[PDB]
């Protein structure tokens, strides 16, 4: 499985968990998804628009993970 594919897979579930009110599970997946995303742009080659997309979504996923862990703690 491609690194990016895994990133999407992990994030996808993360969103489902967030809806299920699983901030903890969602948070873990969010951090993981981002990791794979960053690894894809670095270890994998992609157009500029692609990188920007990952960098944009990446900051979005993390931000969510941050606030999630913020109030959770």
């Amino acid at each position: 499985t491609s690194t990016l594919q895994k990133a999407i897979d992990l994030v996808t579930k993360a969103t489902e968990e967030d809806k299920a009110k699983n901030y903890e599970e969602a948070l873990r997946l969010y951090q993981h998804a981002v990791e794979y995303f960053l690894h894809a742009i670095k270890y994998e080659a992609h157009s500029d628009k692609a990188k920007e997309s990952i960098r944009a979504k990446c900051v979005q996923y993390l931000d969510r993970a941050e606030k999630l862990k913020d109030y959770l703690r």
Partner: peptide, 12 residues
């Protein structure tokens, strides 16, 4: 490239 959008829930 098609990515998902985080769910905007009404959480703290």
């Amino acid at each position: 490239i098609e990515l998902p959008e985080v769910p905007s829930e009404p959480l703290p």
